[PDB]
Coordinates of C-alpha atoms and ligand atoms in Angstrom, one line a residue:
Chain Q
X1 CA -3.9 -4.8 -4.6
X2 CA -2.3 -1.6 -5.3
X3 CA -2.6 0.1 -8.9
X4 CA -0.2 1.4 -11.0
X5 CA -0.3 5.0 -11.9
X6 CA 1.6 7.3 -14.5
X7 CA 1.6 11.0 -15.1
X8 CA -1.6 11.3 -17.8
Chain V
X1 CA -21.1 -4.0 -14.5
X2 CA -22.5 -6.7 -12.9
X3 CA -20.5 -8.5 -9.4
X4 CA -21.4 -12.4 -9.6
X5 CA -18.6 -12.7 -6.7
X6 CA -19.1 -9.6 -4.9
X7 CA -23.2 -9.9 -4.2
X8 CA -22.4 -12.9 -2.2
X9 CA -19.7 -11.1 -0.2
X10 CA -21.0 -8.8 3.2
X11 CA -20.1 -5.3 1.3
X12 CA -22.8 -3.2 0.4
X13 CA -23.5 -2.5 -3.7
X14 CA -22.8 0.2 -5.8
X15 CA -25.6 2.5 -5.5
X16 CA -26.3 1.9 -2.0
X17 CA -25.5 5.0 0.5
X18 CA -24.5 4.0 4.1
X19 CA -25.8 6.0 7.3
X20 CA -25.4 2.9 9.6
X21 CA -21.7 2.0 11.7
X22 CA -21.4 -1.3 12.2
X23 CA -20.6 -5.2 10.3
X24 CA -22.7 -6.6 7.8
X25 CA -22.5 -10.4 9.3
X26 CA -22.4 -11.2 12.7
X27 CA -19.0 -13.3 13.9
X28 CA -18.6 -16.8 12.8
X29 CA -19.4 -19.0 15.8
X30 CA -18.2 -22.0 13.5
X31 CA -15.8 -21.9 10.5
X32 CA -15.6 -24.2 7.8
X33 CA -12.2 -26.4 8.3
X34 CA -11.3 -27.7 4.6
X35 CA -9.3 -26.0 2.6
X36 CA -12.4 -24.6 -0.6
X37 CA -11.5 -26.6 -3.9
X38 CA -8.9 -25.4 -6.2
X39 CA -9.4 -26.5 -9.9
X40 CA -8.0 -29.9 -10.9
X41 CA -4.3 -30.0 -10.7
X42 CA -3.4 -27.3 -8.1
X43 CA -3.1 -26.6 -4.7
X44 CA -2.8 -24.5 -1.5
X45 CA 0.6 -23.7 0.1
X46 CA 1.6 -21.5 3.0
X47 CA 4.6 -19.4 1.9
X48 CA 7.4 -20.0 4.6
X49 CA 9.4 -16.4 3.1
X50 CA 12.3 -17.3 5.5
X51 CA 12.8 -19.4 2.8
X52 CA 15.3 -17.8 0.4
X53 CA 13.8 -19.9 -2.2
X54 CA 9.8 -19.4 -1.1
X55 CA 10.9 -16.1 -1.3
X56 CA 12.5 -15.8 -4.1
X57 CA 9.5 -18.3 -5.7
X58 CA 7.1 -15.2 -4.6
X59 CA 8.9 -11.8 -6.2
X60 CA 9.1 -13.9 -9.6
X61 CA 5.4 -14.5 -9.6
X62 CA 4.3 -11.2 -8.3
X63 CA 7.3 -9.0 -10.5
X64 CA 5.8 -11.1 -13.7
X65 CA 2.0 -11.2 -13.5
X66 CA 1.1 -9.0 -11.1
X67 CA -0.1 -5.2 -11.7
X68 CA 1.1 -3.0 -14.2
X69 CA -0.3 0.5 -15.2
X70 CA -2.8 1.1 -17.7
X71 CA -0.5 1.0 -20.3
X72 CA 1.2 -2.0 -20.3
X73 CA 4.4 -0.7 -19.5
X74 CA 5.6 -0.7 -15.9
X75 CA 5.5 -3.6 -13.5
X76 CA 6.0 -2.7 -10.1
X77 CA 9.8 -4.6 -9.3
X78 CA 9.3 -5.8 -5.9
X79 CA 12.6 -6.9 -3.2
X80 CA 12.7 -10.0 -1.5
X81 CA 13.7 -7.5 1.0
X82 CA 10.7 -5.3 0.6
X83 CA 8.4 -8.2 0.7
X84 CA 9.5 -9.0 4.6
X85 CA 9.2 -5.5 4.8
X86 CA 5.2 -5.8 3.6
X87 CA 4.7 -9.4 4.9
X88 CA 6.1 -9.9 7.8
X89 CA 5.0 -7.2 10.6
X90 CA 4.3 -7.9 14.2
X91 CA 1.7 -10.8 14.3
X92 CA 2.6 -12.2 11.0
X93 CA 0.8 -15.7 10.3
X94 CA 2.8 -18.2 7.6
X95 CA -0.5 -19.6 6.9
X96 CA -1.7 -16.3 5.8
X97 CA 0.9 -16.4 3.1
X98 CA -1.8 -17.8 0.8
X99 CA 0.1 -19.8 -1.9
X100 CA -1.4 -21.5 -4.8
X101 CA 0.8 -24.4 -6.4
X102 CA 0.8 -26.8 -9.8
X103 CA 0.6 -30.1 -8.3
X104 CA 2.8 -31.9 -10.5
X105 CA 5.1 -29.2 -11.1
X106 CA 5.5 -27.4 -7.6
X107 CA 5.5 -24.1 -9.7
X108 CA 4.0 -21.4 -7.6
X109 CA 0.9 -20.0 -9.8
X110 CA -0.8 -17.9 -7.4
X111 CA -0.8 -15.7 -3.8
X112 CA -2.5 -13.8 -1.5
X113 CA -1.6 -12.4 1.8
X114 CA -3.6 -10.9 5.1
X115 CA -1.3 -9.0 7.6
X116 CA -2.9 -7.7 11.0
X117 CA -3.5 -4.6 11.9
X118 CA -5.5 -2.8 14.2
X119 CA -7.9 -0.3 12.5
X120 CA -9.4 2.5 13.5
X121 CA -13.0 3.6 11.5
X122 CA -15.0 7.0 12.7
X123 CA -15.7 6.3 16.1
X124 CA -14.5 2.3 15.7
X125 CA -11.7 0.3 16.3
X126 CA -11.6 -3.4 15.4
X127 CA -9.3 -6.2 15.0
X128 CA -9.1 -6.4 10.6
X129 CA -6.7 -7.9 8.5
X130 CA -4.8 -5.9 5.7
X131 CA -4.9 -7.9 2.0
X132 CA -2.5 -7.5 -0.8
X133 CA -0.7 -9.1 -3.3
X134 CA -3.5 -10.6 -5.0
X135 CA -1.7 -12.0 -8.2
X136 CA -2.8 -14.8 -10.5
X137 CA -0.4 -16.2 -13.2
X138 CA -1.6 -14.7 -16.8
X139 CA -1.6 -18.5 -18.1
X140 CA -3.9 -19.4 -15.2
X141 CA -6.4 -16.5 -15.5
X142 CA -9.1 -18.3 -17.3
X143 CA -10.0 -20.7 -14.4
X144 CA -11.7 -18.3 -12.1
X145 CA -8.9 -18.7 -9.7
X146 CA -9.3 -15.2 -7.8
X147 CA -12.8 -16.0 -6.3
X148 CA -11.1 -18.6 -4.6
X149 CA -7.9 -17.0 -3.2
X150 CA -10.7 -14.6 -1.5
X151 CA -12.7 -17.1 0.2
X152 CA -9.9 -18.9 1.0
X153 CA -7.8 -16.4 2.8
X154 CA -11.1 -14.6 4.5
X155 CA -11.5 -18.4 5.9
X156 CA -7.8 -18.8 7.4
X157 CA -8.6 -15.1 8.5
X158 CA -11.4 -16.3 10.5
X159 CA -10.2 -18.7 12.4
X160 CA -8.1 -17.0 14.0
X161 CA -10.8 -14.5 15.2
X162 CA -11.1 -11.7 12.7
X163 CA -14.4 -10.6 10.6
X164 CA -13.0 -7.2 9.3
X165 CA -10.3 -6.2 6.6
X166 CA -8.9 -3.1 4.4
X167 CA -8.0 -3.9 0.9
X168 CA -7.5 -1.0 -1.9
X169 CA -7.8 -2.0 -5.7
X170 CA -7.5 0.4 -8.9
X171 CA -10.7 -1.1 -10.2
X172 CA -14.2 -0.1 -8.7
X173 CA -16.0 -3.1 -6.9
X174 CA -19.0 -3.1 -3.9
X175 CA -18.3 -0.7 -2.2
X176 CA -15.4 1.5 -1.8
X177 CA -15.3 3.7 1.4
X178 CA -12.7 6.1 -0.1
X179 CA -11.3 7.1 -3.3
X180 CA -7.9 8.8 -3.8
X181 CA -5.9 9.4 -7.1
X182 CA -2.2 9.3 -7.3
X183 CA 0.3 12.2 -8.2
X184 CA 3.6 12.4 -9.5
X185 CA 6.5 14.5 -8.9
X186 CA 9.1 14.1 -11.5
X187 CA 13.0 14.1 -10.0
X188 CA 14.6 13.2 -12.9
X189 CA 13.1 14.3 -16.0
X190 CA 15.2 13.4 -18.3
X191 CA 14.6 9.4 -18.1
X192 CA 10.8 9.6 -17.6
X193 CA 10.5 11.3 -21.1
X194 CA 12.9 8.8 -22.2
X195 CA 11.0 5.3 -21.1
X196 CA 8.1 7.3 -21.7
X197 CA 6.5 7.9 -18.1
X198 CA 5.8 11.0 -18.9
X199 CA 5.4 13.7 -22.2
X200 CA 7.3 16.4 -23.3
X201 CA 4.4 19.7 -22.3
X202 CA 5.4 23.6 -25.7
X203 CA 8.3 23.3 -23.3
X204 CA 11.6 22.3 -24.2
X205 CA 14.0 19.4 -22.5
X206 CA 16.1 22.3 -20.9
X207 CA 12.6 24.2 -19.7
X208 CA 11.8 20.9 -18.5
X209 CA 14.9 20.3 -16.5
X210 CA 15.0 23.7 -15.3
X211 CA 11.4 23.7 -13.6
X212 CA 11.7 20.3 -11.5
X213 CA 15.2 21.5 -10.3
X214 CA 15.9 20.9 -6.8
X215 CA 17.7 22.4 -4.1
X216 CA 20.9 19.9 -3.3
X217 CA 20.5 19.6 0.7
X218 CA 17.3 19.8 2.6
X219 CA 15.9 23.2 4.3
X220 CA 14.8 22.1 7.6
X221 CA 16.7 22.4 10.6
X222 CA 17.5 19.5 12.6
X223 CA 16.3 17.2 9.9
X224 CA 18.1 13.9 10.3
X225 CA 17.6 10.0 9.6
X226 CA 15.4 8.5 11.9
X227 CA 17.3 6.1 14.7
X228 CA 16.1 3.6 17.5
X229 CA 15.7 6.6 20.1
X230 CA 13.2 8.6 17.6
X231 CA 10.8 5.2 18.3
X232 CA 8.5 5.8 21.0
X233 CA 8.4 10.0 19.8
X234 CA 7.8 8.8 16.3
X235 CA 5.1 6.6 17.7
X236 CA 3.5 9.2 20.0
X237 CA 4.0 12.1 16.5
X238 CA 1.5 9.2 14.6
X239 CA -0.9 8.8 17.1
X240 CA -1.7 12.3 17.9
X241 CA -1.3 13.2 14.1
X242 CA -4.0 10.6 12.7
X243 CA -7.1 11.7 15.2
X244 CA -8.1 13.9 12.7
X245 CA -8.8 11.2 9.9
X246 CA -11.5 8.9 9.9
X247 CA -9.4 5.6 8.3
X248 CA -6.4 5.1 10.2
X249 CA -4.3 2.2 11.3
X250 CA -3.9 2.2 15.0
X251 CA -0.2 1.2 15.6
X252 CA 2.1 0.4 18.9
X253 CA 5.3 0.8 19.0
X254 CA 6.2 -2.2 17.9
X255 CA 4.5 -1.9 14.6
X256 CA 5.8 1.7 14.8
X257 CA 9.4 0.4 14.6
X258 CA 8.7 -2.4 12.0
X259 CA 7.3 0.1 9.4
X260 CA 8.9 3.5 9.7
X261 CA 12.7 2.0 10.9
X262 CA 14.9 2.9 8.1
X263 CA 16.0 0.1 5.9
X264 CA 18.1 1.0 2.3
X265 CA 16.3 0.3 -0.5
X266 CA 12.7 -0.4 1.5
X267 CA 11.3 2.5 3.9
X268 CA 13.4 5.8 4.7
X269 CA 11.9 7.9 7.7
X270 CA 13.9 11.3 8.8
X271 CA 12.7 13.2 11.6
X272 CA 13.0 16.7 12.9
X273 CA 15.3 17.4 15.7
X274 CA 15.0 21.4 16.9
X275 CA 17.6 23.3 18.8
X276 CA 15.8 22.6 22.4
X277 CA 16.4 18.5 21.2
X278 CA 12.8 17.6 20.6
X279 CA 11.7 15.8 17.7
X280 CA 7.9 17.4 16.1
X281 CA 8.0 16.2 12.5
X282 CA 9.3 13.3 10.7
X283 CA 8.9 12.5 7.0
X284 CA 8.5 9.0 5.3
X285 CA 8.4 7.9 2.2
X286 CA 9.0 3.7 0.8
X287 CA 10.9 2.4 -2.1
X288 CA 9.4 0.4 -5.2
X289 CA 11.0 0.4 -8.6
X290 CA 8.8 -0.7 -11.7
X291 CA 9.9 -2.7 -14.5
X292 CA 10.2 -0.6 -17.9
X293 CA 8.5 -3.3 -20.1
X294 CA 10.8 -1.9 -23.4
X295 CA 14.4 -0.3 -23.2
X296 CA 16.0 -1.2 -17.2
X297 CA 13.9 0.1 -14.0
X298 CA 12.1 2.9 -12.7
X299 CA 13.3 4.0 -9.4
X300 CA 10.2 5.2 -7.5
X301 CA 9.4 6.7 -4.1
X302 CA 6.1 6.3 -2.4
X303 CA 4.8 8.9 0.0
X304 CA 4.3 7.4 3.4
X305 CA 3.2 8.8 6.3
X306 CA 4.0 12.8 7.2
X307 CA 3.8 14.6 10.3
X308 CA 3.6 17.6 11.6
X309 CA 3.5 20.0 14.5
X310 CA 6.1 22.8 14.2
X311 CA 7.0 22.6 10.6
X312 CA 5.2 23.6 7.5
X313 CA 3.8 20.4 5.3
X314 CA 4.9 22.2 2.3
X315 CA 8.2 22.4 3.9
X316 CA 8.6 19.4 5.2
X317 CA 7.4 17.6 1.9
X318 CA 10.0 20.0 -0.3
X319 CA 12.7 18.1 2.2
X320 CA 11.3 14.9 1.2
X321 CA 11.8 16.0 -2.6
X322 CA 15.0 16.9 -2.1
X323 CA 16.0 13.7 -0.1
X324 CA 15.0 11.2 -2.6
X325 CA 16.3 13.5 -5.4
X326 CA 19.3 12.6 -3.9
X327 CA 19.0 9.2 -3.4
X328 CA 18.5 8.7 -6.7
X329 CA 15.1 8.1 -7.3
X330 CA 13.5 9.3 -10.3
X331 CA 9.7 9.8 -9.6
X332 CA 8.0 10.5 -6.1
X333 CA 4.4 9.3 -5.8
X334 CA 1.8 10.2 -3.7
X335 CA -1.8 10.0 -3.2
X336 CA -4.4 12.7 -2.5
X337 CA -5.2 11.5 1.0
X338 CA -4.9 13.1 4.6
X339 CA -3.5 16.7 3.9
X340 CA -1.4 15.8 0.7
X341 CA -4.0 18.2 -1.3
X342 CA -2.4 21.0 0.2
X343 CA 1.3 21.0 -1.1
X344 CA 0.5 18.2 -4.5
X345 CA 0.0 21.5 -6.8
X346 CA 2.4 23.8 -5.0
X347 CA 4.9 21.4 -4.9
X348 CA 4.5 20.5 -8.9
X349 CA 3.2 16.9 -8.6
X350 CA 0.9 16.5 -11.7
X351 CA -1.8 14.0 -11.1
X352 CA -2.1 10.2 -12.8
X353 CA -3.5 8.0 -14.4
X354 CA -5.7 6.3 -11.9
X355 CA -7.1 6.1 -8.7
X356 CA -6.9 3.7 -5.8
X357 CA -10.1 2.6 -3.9
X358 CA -10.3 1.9 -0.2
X359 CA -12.5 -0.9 0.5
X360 CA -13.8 -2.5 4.0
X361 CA -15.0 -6.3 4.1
X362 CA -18.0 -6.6 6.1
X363 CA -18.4 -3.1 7.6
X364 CA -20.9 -0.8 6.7
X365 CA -20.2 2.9 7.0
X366 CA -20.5 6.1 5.1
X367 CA -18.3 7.2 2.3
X368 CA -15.1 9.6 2.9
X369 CA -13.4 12.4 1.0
X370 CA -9.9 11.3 0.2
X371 CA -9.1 14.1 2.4
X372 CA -10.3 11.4 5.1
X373 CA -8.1 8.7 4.5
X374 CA -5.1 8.0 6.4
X375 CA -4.4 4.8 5.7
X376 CA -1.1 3.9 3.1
X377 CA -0.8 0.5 2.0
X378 CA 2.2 -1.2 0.4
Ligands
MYR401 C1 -5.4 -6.2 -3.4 O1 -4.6 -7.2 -3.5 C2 -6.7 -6.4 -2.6 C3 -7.3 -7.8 -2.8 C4 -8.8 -7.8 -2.9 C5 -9.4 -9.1 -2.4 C6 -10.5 -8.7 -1.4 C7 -10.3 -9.5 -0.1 C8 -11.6 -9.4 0.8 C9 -11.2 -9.7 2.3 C10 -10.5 -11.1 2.3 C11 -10.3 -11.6 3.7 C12 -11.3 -10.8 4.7 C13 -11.5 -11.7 5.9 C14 -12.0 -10.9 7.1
CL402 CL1 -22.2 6.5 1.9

C-alpha cells in the first residue's frame, strides 16, 4: 500500500 | 519490533545484509486449493469492477478505511475510474480482486489486489505480481484479518504460476530493497495553508504566493499531449531510459498504452515533438485527490515516469509544474527515486512526512539507493 505524505 | 507474520514469510529480516541474487523458496510444485479460513461470519469474493456496483462497493471501502497521512487528515479519494486505471492492466485476473465479505450482510469489509507485471531486478527478469490496496475496515481490524488477505492472495498468485511480487508500504517490515521519501511542490499555496497541508515559513501569505509562482504556458518546444502515434516511441523512450536503474518494470507496448495513454482526471502524459518531428522526451504525471478530513478535497498530482534524451530534466519537470498548475491541481508529489534528486531542491519541492519502502516477496538481493529505483506504483 502506498503511504500518505505531507510537507513536514 | 518483532514480525510474528513476516518470519514465516520467504523475505529476509531486518538486520540481515544480502550479497546473494536469487528466490528464497523454490516454485510450488503443488498449491493448496481451499480458499485459508476467514474468521466466523465472513468471506472471500472476487471483485467483478465491470460492475458499477462492485465498483462502486470498492472506492467506498478503500476512500473510508484505507490510508491516510500521519496526521489523521487526508485520505487519498480514489475514482472508480482511477481504480480500472490501477486494476485492470493487460493480463488482469478477477480472481485477483481479493474481496472479503460479511456473510449475512454482503457488506464488502475487506480487499486486496495483485496485477501482473514483468519485473526487471539487477541482472533479473521474472514473472511477479504488483500488490496494492490492502485495506481492512477499521471496525474489523481487531480480527487479524490482514495475515489472511496476504496468504490468501499469494495463493491465487500461485496458481497461476508466479512466485515473485513488488509491494511498497510506509511502514518498515522484512526487508525493504529500497527506501525513497516523498516531496512536495506546492501549486497553490493559498489552500494548502488553509486545510493545513502545509505551514506558513517568517514569510508572509504574499511572499508565499510570490515564490511558488509559475510561468502560465510551458517552455519546451514541441511539447504536446501524448496521442495513439506517440505509443510505440513512448514505449521504445521507457525502455532505453530504465537500463540504468536496477528496479524497473519491463513493459510492452501494450502495457505502455494502458498506463501512460492520457485519460482526464487519471494519468496525463505529454511528449516532446522537435522541429525535425521526432519525439525524445515525454513527461507523466497521475491524478489522486485526498479527502480533507475537516473543512472538500485536495487535488493532487503524482510524478510518474520522466524521460529524457534531448531535454534538460529540470526543464522538462518545470513543464510538468506548469501543466498541472494549470489543470488545477494544487500539490505535485514526487518521490526521490531514479534522477528526481536532481531537480526536487532546484525546483522548490520541500520534502514529507514519510517514506515509501520497496519490498520483494521471495527474492533475495542487495539493498538500493533510492536513486536506484524506477519503479512508481499507484
Ligand atoms: C500495499 O498494499 C502492499 C501490501 C503488502 C502485502 C504484502 C504482499 C506480499 C506478497 C503477496 C502475494 C505474493 C505472491 C507471489
Ligand atoms: Cl543488502
Amino acid at each position: 500500500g502506498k503511504s500518505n505524505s505531507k510537507l513536514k | 519490533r518483532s514480525y510474528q507474520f513476516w518470519d514465516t514469510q520467504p523475505v529476509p529480516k531486518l538486520g540481515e545484509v544480502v550479497n546473494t541474487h536469487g528466490p528464497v523458496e523454490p516454485d510450488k510444485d503443488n498449491i493448496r486449493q481451499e480458499p485459508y479460513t476467514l474468521p466466523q461470519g465472513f468471506t472471500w469474493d472476487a471483485l467483478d469492477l465491470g460492475d458499477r456496483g462492485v465498483l462502486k462497493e470498492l472506492y467506498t471501502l478503500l476512500n473510508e478505511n484505507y490510508v491516510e497521512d500521519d496526521d489523521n487528515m487526508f485520505r487519498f479519494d480514489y475514482s472508480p475510474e482511477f481504480l480500472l486505471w490501477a486494476l485492470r492492466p493487460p493480463g488482469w485476473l478477477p480472481q485477483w480482486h481479493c474481496g472479503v465479505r460479511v456473510v449475512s450482510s454482503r457488506k464488502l469489509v475487506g480487499f486486496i489486489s495483485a496485477i501482473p507485471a514483468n519485473i526487471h531486478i539487477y541482472d533479473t527478469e521474472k514473472k511477479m505480481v504488483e500488490i496494492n490496496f490492502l485495506c481492512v475496515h477499521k471496525k474489523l481490524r481487531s480480527k487479524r484479518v490482514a495475515p489472511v488477505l496476504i496468504r490468501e492472495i499469494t495463493r491465487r498468485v500461485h496458481l497461476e504460476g508466479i512466485f515473485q511480487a513488488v509491494y511498497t508500504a510506509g511502514v518498515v517490515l522484512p526487508k525493504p530493497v529500497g527506501t525513497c521519501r516523498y516531496w512536495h511542490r506546492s501549486l497553490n499555496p493559498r489552500k494548502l495553508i488553509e486545510v493545513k497541508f502545509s505551514h506558513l515559513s517568517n514569510m508572509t501569505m504574499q511572499r508565499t504566493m510570490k515564490l511558488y509562482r509559475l510561468p502560465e504556458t510551458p517552455k519546451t518546444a514541441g511539447l504536446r499531449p501524448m496521442e495513439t502515434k506517440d505509443i510505440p516511441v513512448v514505449h521504445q523512450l521507457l525502455t532505453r531510459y530504465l537500463k540504468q536503474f536496477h528496479l524497473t518494470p519491463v513493459m510492452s507496448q501494450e502495457e505502455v498504452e494502458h498506463w501512460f495513454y492520457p485519460q482526464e482526471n487519471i494519468i496525463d502524459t505529454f511528449v516532446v515533438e522537435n522541429a525535425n518531428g521526432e519525439v525524445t522526451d515525454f513527461l507523466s504525471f497521475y491524478t489522486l485527490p485526498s479527502t480533507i478530513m475537516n473543512h472538500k478535497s485536495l487535488k493532487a498530482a503524482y510524478s510518474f515516469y520522466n524521460v529524457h534524451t534531448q531535454t534538460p530534466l529540470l526543464d522538462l519537470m518545470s513543464d510538468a509544474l506548469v501543466l498541472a498548475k494549470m489543470k488545477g491541481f494544487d500539490v505535485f508529489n514526487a518521490l526521490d527515486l531514479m534522477e528526481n534528486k536532481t531537480f526536487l531542491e532546484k525546483l522548490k519541492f520541500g520534502i514529507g512526512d514519510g517514506n515509501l519502502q520497496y519490498y520483494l516477496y521471495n527474492w533475495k538481493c542487495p539493498s538500493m539507493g533510492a536513486e536506484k529505483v524506477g519503479l512508481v506504483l499507484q
